[PDB]
Design a protein around this ligand. Structure first.
Ligand SMILES: [Mg+2]
Ligand SMILES: [Mg+2]
Ligand SMILES: [Mg+2]
Ligand SMILES: [Mg+2]
Ligand SMILES: [Mg+2]
Ligand SMILES: [Mg+2]
Lengths: 87, 287, 250, 73, 132, 97, 110
């Protein structure tokens, strides 16, 4: 006998069918799309501008940053006041 | 190898001649014969013999030992404490001697991880590597190394030999990318910014004596000389050193990699790096 | 002229190379056309027959799924009502006609559902097993190094006759470098032969080597085999799965 | 045996076959879409993060709507 | 006008990040022993009946071991050749230190020699002199 | 006991049929193939136990987790009851506490 | 149209004039006569070993097995290898032709 051809992983970018109900949800997110570009680069067909945050998304990131991540000067000033209160 | 000559004499190895290594398999005992049958090892009839004895820690109705002891905050906040993998100078010298860490280029957590010198677990609350004084007496290498924490004795050994040490802060998201850059690149996202230390750690990383990456450079010469006088060595003028450009190299407080700015996309497949041109994004990343 | 092959990786200085006769399948008498070096760390490893036992048993037992099942008392039809009263009957007490003691009842401890036997041997252990198996075939004169699998004719009888002439075994395992480029003549000959089996280099395994009496390796396959197996020692542990990019790994 | 599709997708499948398929596209959009009504009987979380008072750590919070019974009347 | 510009110049820093899968060969040093203490196997090769090979990390394969929480042992592992000759030398070398013959196990299948008690440092120094 | 009065038909086994002859091939797909595929990916079986092993309680929970939403009513009711029985056995019954 | 040659037995008996044959081959392989200490010539050269070993196998009819090539370090080992006989008869086959006592009877059903 001759053995069957060796099993191989499917090559190239893979875009699942959106309409098909069976197709798993996780494969249709933008997160999945970006992963195709990372592995296969240009041949993925992803428009690179999509990889970066969109202007509405950019505002959300900046809004989140201000609330929870203060600037160095504010951090220093608050620490200074606490020492004075302790002193 | 005379053992291979023995194989020549013996019959063919095959599926019919196979044998496990001696004593590799214990015998499984079934309750069928008189020895292990009958009561089957469970004893006389009772709660234990019927399989319904009380749970572990139950003491027959008196207040159990694990409940009578007062509650005390030994492990309070344990999951939120930061852990630092300790790297000793003895281990650092061993890695440098065997070629696993390249002293010509600057040393960061990525190089230590790539050479397997240190094992980092961000999921288990690691915030990086601390320099440990052990092995200081026998450390004889000139190195540029970036660590998250350092001790006075460890810093003394690095500086005495002519090297540079700085303490830098990486956040949990940044630490994972730094430890394993390539898996991050395959995701296809742009490189994120590095968050500044929490308010608790701001004093540490803004202090010259700790060689903080946010500390004032103007105060470094005084701090460096003070160690020299305290520990009885002569401070070496590293500017004259030929490798001064490498030794002086330091990352920007918001940069994860030496030559990659925040917001770039690493296209490993095509050997390219893509940079955003939108002004609003550039303000976001440049900040 | 002689076909003299040398190992492409560096042999340890304290160990001398192992060697074999290069052969050709073009003619019946072409039993020696070259002399090939073999890395001692692959073809002259310690004769570790327990590790051969480990790997071959792993290969058989990690795929295994048993589809044997029996119904418990809860899954057999009926059985809800208590058959007769506890007291004033003269009978043994029962609560269901489907208990294990009854004919037609459930099975107390029978096979349960589809069951898997999956486990993985360490990667170094499985690689070590292949090196031991290759050494065993060589030292027992069951391994034949060949330059190429080209054959003069496609008749399967010719291949069987050649095996008898050269004192090969009843069953022969033939290895070629890659499935795509394997010669047409050998493909036709092996297709109809039960005991002559043709596999590519990536298909080599300990179990098939034990099942077949003699092993035939092409010269390119030997270099392929040496490279992969010797890589296993002198390697780091994985930072992440090796399918991902590495500095020096294909 | 097993059903080819999960049970939660059964309603979508029916809308995709038979006389249901012939319904206008805009009408099916109303049927297909599932949107949560405005909160009535519970206070929504103003933010997506709050500080857990005990350990003093930022914790994600979600809005879980109260189940409400709407009589046929 | 796309929002992205492509540059190949900075890929050098990306290449620097790739980790190796192969343990690097130790660099040549002007003076041995190295400050850590490591020294490579000597050349010419030792002419003894037994050869002790180095580990994949280029260290002498001697390991302290303990079982049962009280049984201290030391293991010489990657021995090629006559493992019985090594046992003879080990017994003579360790006998004066003990004042009695050491208890040892020879595993001829695995190629390792096991000794009762902790003698890793003495055996590590001992095997360096022989040049393994 | 009663015994057969005749010999059953002899069992004929072809040891060199294609399945027996080629058993094991590609079990080293990873180490010999640059690790593109793990050998477990060659295992054929129920979706919830390909390349996985566990005790019966674990298998019952895993099947429900994988294909619980596509199961028949009789089967799902029986599977759920099996979980509760095994849960009570492993967590409350036995010799060793 | 390809005819397999008749199968040849694996039985080898050392030739009486083994020294004459071997030195002649060595002289041809070297091509410069026989130098004293010929027996100790090292076979590390790949080309020489193939010519010497392959030539002997063709004429003598006995070939060095793959297991034993690494052992043929020097010409002495090649000389030693060819002088040891190989017998195709099984240990049982010898018993049949071993002048059995009159009360011992052996029958071969194979
Ligand atoms: Mg049992
Ligand atoms: Mg750890
Ligand atoms: Mg019932
Ligand atoms: Mg009832
Ligand atoms: Mg009942
Ligand atoms: Mg039944």
């Amino acid at each position: 006998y001759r053995a069957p051809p060796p099993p191989r992983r499917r090559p190239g970018p893979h875009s699942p069918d959106p309409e098909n109900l069976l197709t798993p949800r996780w494969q249709l997110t933008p997160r999945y799309v970006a992963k195709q570009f990372g592995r296969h680069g240009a041949i993925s067909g992803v428009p690179p501008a999509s990889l970066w945050p969109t202007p509405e998304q950019l505002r959300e990131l900046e809004a989140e940053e201000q609330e929870w991540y203060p600037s160095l000067a504010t951090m220093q000033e608050s620490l200074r006041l606490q020492q004075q209160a302790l002193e | 190898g005379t053992s291979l000559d023995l194989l020549r004499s013996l019959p063919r190895v095959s599926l019919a001649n196979l044998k496990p290594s001696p004593n590799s398999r214990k015998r499984e005992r079934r309750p069928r014969d008189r020895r292990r049958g009958r009561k089957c090892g469970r004893g006389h009839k009772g709660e234990r013999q019927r399989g319904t004895r009380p749970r572990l820690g139950f003491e027959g109705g008196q207040t159990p030992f694990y409940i009578r002891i007062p509650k005390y905050g030994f492990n309070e906040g344990h999951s939120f404490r930061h852990q630092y993998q300790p790297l000793s100078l003895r281990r650092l010298q061993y890695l440098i001697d065997l070629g696993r860490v390249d002293p010509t280029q600057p040393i960061d957590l990525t190089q230590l991880v790539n050479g397997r010198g240190v094992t980092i677990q961000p999921l288990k609350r690691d915030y990086g590597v601390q320099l440990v004084e052990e092995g200081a007496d026998t450390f004889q290498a000139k190195i540029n190394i970036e660590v998250q924490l350092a001790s006075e004795l460890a810093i003394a050994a690095i500086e005495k030999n002519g090297g540079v040490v700085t303490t830098a802060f990486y956040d949990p998201r940044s630490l994972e990318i730094l430890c394993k850059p390539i898996p991050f690149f395959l995701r296809g996202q742009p490189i994120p910014k590095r968050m500044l230390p929490p308010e608790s750690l701001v004093p540490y990383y803004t202090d010259a004596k700790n060689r903080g990456y946010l500390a004032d450079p103007a105060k470094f010469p005084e701090a460096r000389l003070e160690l020299a006088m305290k520990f009885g060595y002569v401070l070496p003028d590293i500017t004259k050193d030929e490798l001064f450009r490498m030794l002086s190299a330091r990352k920007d407080p918001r940069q994860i990699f030496f030559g990659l700015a925040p917001g770039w996309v690493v296209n490993m497949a095509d050997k390219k790096i893509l940079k955003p041109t939108d002004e609003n994004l550039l303000k976001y990343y440049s900040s | 002229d002689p076909v003299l092959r040398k190992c492409e990786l560096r042999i340890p200085v304290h160990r001398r190379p192992v060697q074999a006769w290069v052969e050709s399948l073009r003619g019946f008498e072409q039993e020696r056309i070259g002399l090939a070096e073999l890395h001692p760390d692959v073809f002259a490893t310690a004769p570790r027959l327990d590790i051969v036992h480990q790997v071959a048993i792993w290969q058989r037992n990690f795929r295994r799924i048993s589809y044997a099942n029996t119904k418990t008392r809860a899954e057999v039809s009926g059985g809800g009502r208590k058959p007769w009263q506890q007291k004033g009957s003269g009978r043994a007490r029962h609560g269901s006609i489907r208990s294990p003691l009854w004919r037609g009842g459930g099975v107390a401890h029978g096979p349960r559902g589809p069951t898997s036997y999956y486990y993985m041997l360490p990667m170094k252990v499985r690689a070590l097993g292949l090196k031991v198996a290759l050494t065993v075939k060589l030292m027992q004169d069951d391994l034949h190094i060949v330059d190429s699998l080209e054959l003069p004719t496609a008749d399967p009888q010719y291949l069987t006759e050649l095996a008898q002439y050269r004192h090969w075994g009843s069953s022969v395992l033939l290895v070629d470098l890659t499935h795509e480029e394997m010669p047409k003549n050998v493909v036709a000959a092996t297709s109809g032969l039960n005991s002559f089996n043709l596999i590519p280099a990536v298909g080599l395994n300990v179990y098939s080597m034990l099942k077949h009496q003699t092993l035939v390796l092409t010269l390119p396959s030997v270099a392929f085999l040496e490279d992969k197996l010797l890589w296993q020692d002198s390697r780091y542990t994985p930072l992440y799965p090796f399918r991902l990019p590495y500095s020096d790994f294909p | 045996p097993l059903h080819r599709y999960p049970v939660h997708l059964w309603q979508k499948l029916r809308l995709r076959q038979g006389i249901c398929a012939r319904l206008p596209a805009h009408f099916l959009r109303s049927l297909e879409e599932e949107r949560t009504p405005t909160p009535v009987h519970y206070k929504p979380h103003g933010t997506k993060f709050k500080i857990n008072p005990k350990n003093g750590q930022r914790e994600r919070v979600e809005d879980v709507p109260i189940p409400v019974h709407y009589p046929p009347e | 006008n796309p929002g992205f510009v492509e540059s190949v110049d900075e890929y050098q820093f990306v290449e620097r990040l790739l980790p190796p899968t192969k343990i690097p060969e130790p660099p040549k040093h002007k003076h041995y022993p190295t400050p850590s203490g490591w020294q490579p196997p000597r050349d010419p090769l030792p002419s003894l009946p037994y050869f002790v090979r180095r580990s994949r990390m280029h260290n002498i394969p001697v390991y302290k071991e303990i079982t049962h929480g009280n049984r201290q042992m030391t293991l010489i592992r990657k021995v090629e050749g006559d493992i019985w000759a090594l046992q003879k030398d080990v017994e003579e070398f360790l006998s004066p230190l003990l004042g009695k013959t050491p208890i040892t196990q020879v595993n001829e299948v695995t190629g390792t020699l096991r000794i009762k008690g902790y003698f890793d440092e003495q055996l590590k120094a001992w095997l360096l002199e022989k040049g393994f | 006991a009663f015994v057969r009065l005749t010999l059953p038909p002899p069992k004929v086994v072809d040891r060199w049929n294609e399945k027996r002859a080629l058993f094991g091939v590609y079990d080293n797909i990873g180490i010999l193939g640059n690790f593109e595929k793990h050998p477990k990916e060659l295992i054929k079986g129920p979706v919830w136990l390909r390349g996985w092993r566990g005790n019966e309680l674990q298998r019952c929970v895993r099947k429900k987790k994988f294909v619980g939403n596509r199961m028949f009513i009789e089967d799902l009711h029986n599977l759920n009851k099996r979980i509760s029985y095994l849960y009570k056995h492993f967590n409350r019954h036995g010799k060793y506490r | 149209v390809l005819v397999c040659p008749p199968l040849r037995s694996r039985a080898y008996t050392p030739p009486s004039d083994l020294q004459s044959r071997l030195e002649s081959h060595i002289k041809e392989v070297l091509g410069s006569s026989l130098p004293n200490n010929w027996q100790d010539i090292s076979l590390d050269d790949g080309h020489m070993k193939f010519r010497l070993l392959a030539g002997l196998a063709d004429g003598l009819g006995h070939a060095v097995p793959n297991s034993r090539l690494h052992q043929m370090c020097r010409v002495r080992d090649v000389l030693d290898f060819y002088n040891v006989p190989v017998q195709d008869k099984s240990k049982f086959d010898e018993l049949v032709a071993s002048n059995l006592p009159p009360n011992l009877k052996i029958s071969w059903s194979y």
